[PDB]
Amino acid sequence: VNPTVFFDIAVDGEPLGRVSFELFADKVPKTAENFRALSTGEKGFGYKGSCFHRIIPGFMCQGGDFTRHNGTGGKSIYGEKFEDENFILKHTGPGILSMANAGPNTNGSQFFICTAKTEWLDGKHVVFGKVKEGMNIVEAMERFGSRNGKTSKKITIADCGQLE
């Protein structure tokens, strides 16, 4: 029943590969629905064409700022911010999909893909999905990151949507 969405990733316009995510709508429905709708664009705005603005190898890939492209923008389908839904799920290893925020109850559209176990984020960021296919593409994206998070090449979501 849990939806699966995909991103097609491009490096400097050149196709890199596809990553698919399972969204845990069974446990975090409001959070999962936000990501799903932003991935299909069905509300008229969303992730297509946006970049991953912060990539720290051995830590995570961060994206979802489709309004200022640098970590200061984004918005949810529910308004500018929405609440922390729950902290049922934990940051247990690579492939976890979790919400970025600016403090309690500040979720918008930014998210990060963990490329390591990040237990210190438990109870502070809402985990809502995991990589299903293409973890190897995430590992490839990592090689364009750096210690301070700046990317050497532009990593963009060339296309995205729902598979199931």
101 is catalytic: yes
Place of tokens 């963990």: 114
Place of tokens 């490329």: 115
Place of tokens 């200022």: 68
- Number of other residues whose CB lies within 10 A of the CB of residue 70: 10
Expt. technique: X-ray
Which is catalytic among the residues 24, 82, 112, 144?
112
54 is catalytic: yes
- Number of other residues whose CB lies within 10 A of the CB of residue 94: 18
Which is catalytic among the residues 97, 121, 128, 144?
121
Instruction: Count how many Cα atoms sit within 13 Å of the Cα of residue 27 in the half-sphere of its side chain.
Output: 13
What are the DSSP E strand ranges found in the chain? 4-11, 14-23, 54-56, 60-63, 96-99, 111-114, 127-133, 155-162
Spatial strand order of the sheet with 96-99 comes to 54-56, 60-63, 111-114, 96-99, 127-133, 14-23, 4-11, 155-162
Resolution, Å (one decimal): 1.7
Contact assessment for residue 151 and residue 116, using Cβ atoms and an 8 Å cutoff:
no
- Number of other residues whose CB lies within 10 A of the CB of residue 141: 23
62 is catalytic: yes
Architecture field, domain 1-164: Beta Barrel (2.40)
Q: Give the span between the Cα atoms of 83 and 112, in whole angstroms.
A: 17
Residue type, 10: A
**Residue of 21, 10, 107 whose CA lies nearest to 50:** 10
107 is catalytic: no
Torsion angles phi and psi, residue 107, rounded to 5: -70, 135
CA-to-CA separations, 85 to 33, 62, 128, 145, in angstroms, rounded:
12, 20, 10, 30
Which is catalytic among the residues 36, 53, 54, 91?
54
Which is catalytic among the residues 23, 66, 89, 101?
101
User: 22-39 b/e with 16+ CB inside 10 Å = b?
Assistant: bbbbeebebbbbbbbbbb
121 is catalytic: yes
**Residue of 46, 61, 59 whose CA lies nearest to 155:** 61
Which is catalytic among the residues 62, 91, 128, 144?
62
- Tell me the domain boundaries of the chain: 1-164
By DSSP bridging, strand 111-114 and strand 96-99 are antiparallel
